[PDB]
mmCIF file of C-alpha atoms in Angstrom:
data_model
loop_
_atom_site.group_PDB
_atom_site.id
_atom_site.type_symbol
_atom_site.label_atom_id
_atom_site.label_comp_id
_atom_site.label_asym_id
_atom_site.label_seq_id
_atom_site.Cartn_x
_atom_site.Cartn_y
_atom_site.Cartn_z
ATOM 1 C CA UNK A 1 -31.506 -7.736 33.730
ATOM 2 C CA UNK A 2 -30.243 -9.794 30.870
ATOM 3 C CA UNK A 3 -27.258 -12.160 31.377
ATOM 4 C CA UNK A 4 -24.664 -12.740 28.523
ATOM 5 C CA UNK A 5 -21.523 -14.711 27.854
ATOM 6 C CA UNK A 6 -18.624 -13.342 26.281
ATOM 7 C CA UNK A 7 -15.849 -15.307 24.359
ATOM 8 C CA UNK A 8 -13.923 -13.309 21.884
ATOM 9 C CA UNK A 9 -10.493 -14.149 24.512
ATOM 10 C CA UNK A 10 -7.215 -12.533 24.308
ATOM 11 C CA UNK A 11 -4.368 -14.235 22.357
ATOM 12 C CA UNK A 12 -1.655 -12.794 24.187
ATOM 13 C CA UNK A 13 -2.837 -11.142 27.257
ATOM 14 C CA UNK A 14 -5.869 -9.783 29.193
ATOM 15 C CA UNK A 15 -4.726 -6.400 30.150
ATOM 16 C CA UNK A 16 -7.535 -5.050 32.861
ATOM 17 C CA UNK A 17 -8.675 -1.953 32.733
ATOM 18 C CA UNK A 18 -11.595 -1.458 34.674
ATOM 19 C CA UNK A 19 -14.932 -3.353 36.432
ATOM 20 C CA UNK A 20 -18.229 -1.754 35.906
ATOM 21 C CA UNK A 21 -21.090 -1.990 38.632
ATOM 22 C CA UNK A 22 -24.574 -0.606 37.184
ATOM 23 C CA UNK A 23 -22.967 1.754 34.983
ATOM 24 C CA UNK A 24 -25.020 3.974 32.822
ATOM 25 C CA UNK A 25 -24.353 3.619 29.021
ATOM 26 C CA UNK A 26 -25.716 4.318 25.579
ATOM 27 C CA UNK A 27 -25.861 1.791 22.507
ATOM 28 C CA UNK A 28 -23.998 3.687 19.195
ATOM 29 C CA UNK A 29 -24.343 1.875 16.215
ATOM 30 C CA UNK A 30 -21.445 2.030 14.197
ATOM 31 C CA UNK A 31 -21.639 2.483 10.280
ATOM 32 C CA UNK A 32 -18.529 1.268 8.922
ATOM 33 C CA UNK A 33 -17.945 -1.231 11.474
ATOM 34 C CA UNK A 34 -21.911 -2.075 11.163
ATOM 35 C CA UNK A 35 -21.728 -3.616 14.989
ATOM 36 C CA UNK A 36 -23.014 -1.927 18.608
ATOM 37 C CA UNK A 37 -21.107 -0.087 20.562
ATOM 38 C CA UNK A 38 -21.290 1.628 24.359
ATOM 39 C CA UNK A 39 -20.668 4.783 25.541
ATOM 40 C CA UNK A 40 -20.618 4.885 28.891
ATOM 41 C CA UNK A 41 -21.791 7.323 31.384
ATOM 42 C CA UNK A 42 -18.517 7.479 33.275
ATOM 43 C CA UNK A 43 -15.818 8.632 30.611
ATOM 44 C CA UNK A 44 -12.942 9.202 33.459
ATOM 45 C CA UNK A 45 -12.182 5.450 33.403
ATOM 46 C CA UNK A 46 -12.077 5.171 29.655
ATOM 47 C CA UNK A 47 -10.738 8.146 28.639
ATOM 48 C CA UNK A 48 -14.196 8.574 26.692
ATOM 49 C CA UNK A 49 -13.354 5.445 24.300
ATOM 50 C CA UNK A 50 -16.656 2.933 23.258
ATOM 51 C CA UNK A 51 -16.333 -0.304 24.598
ATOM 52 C CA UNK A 52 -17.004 -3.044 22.029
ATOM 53 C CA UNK A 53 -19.078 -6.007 23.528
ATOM 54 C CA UNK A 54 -16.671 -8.485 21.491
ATOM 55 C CA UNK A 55 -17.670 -11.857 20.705
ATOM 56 C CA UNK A 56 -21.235 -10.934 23.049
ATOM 57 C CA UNK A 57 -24.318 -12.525 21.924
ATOM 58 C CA UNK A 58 -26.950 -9.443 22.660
ATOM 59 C CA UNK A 59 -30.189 -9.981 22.235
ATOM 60 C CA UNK A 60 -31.723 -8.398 19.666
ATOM 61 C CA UNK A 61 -33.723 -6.191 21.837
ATOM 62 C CA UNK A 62 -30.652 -4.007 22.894
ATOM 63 C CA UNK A 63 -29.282 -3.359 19.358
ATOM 64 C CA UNK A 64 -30.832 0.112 18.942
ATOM 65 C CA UNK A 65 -28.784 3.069 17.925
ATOM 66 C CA UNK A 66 -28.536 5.231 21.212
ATOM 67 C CA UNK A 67 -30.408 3.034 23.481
ATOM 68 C CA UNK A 68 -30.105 3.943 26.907
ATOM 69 C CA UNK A 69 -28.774 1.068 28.776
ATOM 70 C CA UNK A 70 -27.578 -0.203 32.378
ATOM 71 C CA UNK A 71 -24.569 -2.457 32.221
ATOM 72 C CA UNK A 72 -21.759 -4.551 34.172
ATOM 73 C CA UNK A 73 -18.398 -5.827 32.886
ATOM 74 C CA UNK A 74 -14.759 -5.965 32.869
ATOM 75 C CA UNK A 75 -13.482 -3.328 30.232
ATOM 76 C CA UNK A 76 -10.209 -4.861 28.843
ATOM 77 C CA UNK A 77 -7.436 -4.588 26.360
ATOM 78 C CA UNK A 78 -5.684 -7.337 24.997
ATOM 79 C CA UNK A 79 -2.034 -7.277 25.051
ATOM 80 C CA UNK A 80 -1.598 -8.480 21.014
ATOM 81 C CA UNK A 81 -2.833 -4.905 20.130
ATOM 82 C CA UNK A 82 -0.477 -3.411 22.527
ATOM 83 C CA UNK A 83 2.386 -3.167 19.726
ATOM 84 C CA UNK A 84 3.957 -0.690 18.118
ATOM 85 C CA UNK A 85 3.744 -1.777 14.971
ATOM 86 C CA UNK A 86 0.172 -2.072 15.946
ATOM 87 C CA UNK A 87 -2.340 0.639 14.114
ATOM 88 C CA UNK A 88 -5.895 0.221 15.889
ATOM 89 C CA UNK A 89 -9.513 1.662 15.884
ATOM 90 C CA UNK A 90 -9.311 3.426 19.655
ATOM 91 C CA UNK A 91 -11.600 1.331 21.554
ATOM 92 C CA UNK A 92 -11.740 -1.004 24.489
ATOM 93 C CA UNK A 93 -13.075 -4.284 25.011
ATOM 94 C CA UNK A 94 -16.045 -5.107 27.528
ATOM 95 C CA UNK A 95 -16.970 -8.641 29.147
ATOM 96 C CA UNK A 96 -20.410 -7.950 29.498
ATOM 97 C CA UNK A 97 -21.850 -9.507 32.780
ATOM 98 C CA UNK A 98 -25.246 -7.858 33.056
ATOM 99 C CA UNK A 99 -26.724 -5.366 31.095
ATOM 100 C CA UNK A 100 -30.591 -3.903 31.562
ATOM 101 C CA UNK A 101 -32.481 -0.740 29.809
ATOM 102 C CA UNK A 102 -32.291 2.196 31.279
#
């Protein structure tokens, strides 16, 4: 179990989505972006999307394309983004809390 601290805050507002508990995940590594992703295990509560561990410090022993992972967070939009005017890359945001290879 590694511990991590998150800071990339909300301007507007945290919109909740969902808290994981030891939830299994994958690392993707994303090409154009060039940052880490996770796919999670349980796609119901996402609706599938990769959850970008924004503004987490992850020790560079995680950051391995496809990486099989155990994690905890609070998955999160932020409300700025929410906009109709608003044309985003389809993710979600995660608070990591915990994460540990699989």
């Amino acid at each position: 179990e590694s511990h991590a601290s998150c800071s990339c805050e909300c301007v507007e507002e945290k919109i909740p989505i969902v808290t994981l508990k030891n939830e299994n995940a994958h690392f993707r590594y994303m090409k154009r972006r060039n940052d880490f992703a996770l796919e999670i295990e349980n796609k119901e509560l996402v609706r599938g999307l990769y959850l970008i561990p924004r503004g987490c410090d992850i020790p560079k022993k995680y950051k391995e394309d496809g990486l099989p992972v155990i994690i905890s967070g609070e998955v999160f939009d932020c409300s700025e983004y929410i906009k109709p005017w608003i044309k985003r890359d389809p993710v979600y945001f995660i608070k990591l809390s915990t994460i540990k290879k699989k």
